[model samples]
Target: SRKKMGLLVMAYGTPYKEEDIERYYTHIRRGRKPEPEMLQDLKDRYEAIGGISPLAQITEQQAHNLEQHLNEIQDEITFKAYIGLKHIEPFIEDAVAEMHKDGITEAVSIVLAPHFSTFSVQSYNKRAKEEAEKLGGLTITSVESWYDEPKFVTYWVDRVKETYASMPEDERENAMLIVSAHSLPEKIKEFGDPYPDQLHESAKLIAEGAGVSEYAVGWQSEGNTPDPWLGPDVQDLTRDLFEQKGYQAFVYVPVGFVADHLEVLYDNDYECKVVTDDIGASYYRPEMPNAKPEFIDALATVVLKKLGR
Candidate 1:
């Protein structure tokens, strides 16, 4: 009998509808209710991009696509991708239970995001493992990190090159690539989190491979908390580069996100765009990998390596 495994594709899920806002927000906040004004702001951001985000659909497709690719390319084992959301319906626990119900003895979980931060993928891994523990029959494993995977690096490296080529020849003269990711609590550094360092490494590699000399690693979509998170902040960094460094054009690579969700569409495209426009500077972002073939391949490659005997 051949071996089989479940690929628990996980992501920070979003509310599927406008009415689900508070419910989703409270879950993320761990049962705390947001102020009416604050809740409205979150809703407004979702509205600005659209009343709903395409994340749920896209993530589902990512799972569906990765599974197909895995099946088509390999006969040694059967792979099925089950979706797990961190804050939404069909949560990680639910997905693990489903895999258990289906009689999958072994499984590997991989978050859509590439990096490994305790605040991020580690949480997903722990939750999945905990669910398997509660169920008492299945063993769930995790892909701790995959940012350095060859296809992943290749995808971003190629994007950086293309983005660089798209800038106006004159503006390209002083262009800088701002590589970014979601910011975590500044205190994580005290624990020696690999997040900040990993972000910088990918930024450095893409910048160099694209043949760009001026670039900086920054953090975006920081939480509403007062505590300091990772920086230099992307918006501030964008402003300062022009103010102090005289960079006239910039290309933003939100390498932290694999899809166009609130952070990408609203935060970066709308909020950060406002900052770039205020200074009268040119700005561009190479498209994210989303459910595209390159990303599907990268996910497949990462998951395949993690499925072992």
Candidate 2:
């Protein structure tokens, strides 16, 4: 007998275009409107990055490809993937409802983020479960986090060595690999959140595998909060490491996010590059696993493990 399942692929959604930016921001802020300058600055960032992000498209491709890959690898299970967003339309709740409507009684949830945090990955999984609760038929088993998966570790190690091998010999010698993820409030430590700990662990594994002699764990794309977030922020590390420690190049690996977005395209590519360019140093970031076969396979492995298959 075959099993029918729905794969809920969740992500942090981006606005489709200039017109949707305000609404998108509104959803993120939970109905609190941003101040005029605040909104303008975000709009400026979007405009700087050509007024759109490939986030939605890449996520769509990932979910679509994951469905095909899962079914191809196994015949006993028929899988259908659905893309869900946290702060935009077709949200996790709606996606769950869609799964119910599509006659899927069993489903699995996975966030685009790798590491788990109470406020991040758990929240997404909670939403999926809660929505399933409301509908009463669908059952959701969430893949809490996939960062610690062996394939995930292999992926980053491969990426780091590949990018490092392509750099000029001089740059490679002077480069310091910085593994990073989005910064959350410093207060997460109070709750014993495993976020920071897991990040460093992943960094350690990747560096060991890549044989990277000079590497440090850092944080990036911190929120606009006053109480402080994770550090040393990747941006400051890029600048300070070069200026103070005399490293000439930076190899940044964003371990949090899975696809190209404002953070990757603008924050890492533009803002981080600006720091290196001003100081006459070098900066490099690996391409994200957007719809890539290796990443999809890793995700498939994670899903299979979670299902006890």
Candidate 3:
């Protein structure tokens, strides 16, 4: 005699077009001006990519895919899945309210982002709870983060390995790997948030999984804040590796980003590429782990195990 359970998939959203830049950036900026030229530059990137991100579409597919996989288990639990975006339409609170109206009493929140830190995952947990409280009579359990989960870790490791195997043999050995995550403001670290430390641990785990001995962890996707942000930024690192160490080929693993979004699209593809080109180094990016069938199955296994099913 339990109320039907539901799963909510959350993500960080993006602007749809050159016209929507201010609207989307406003959400991210929280009303602070994020520099005029930087905003325009971002608008241009969106323009080149057809003036929209595939995130919303991809996320919808991911939720549907996860639900379909779960249904195959033949469990009688009445389960539904919904997608929420932290920065766009179908925002977390509104999505939770809709779930409440649909008679879903117990909810499990899962982020599209695989890794978790308080800064990244706590927002979803807190906001979902706030909305559920208003709607009343709902029990909410959130997956705070899943960095070291066996399946999650193994999926990415396999991606790195397969990508390396595809490269020419001469370009493989003594190759330097650069793993990067979105950079948070230094203020967060001062308060003792574990983001930096957690990123390093995740990097080490991935390096071991990929069988790489020489690599470095750096920061990317930095917010436009006046204060200092996390360091050894990827752009700078690319130059350092080329000029300082003479690393001819660079393999960039966007460890923080699980999907191919603007960060991967711009930071690695455009910004990092320019730096590498200027420094005369070859550059390549490992593909994002975007709801592959094997990965989805692995993730489903984790959720089911958590439910003790």
TM-score of 3: 0.92
Tell me how candidate 2 scores on lDDT: 0.87
Candidate 2: lDDT of 114? 91
State the lDDT at 89 in candidate 3: 81
Q: Candidate 2 lDDT, tens digit per residue, 1-309?
A: 788999999988878777787888887777878888988898898878765846578888988998999999988898989888988888888899999998999998889899999878888999889989998978999998889899888998999999999989988888899899989988988889999999998899999999998888999888775698889988888777777688878888998888888988888999889988898888789888888999999999999999987
Q: Who is ahead in TM-score, 1 or 3?
A: 1
lDDT of 3 by residue, 34-123 (tens): 578978787778765554757556677777777778767646565689878888788888889889998888878788776666666787
Scanning candidate 3 in windows of ten residues, the lowest lDDT window is: 47-56
Clash counts for all predictions:
0, 0, 0
The TM-scores, one per candidate, come to 0.96, 0.95, 0.92
Which residue segments of model 1 deviate by more than 4 Å? none
lDDT per residue, candidate 1, 1-309, as tens digits?
657888898999978888889999898788888889989998888888866847578888889999998887778878888999989888989999999999998888889888899887888899899999999889977998888888888898898888777777888888878999999999887778899889888888787777888889889988767788888889999998889977777789999898888989987898778988898888788898988989898888888787742
**What is the lDDT for 126 in model 3?**
88
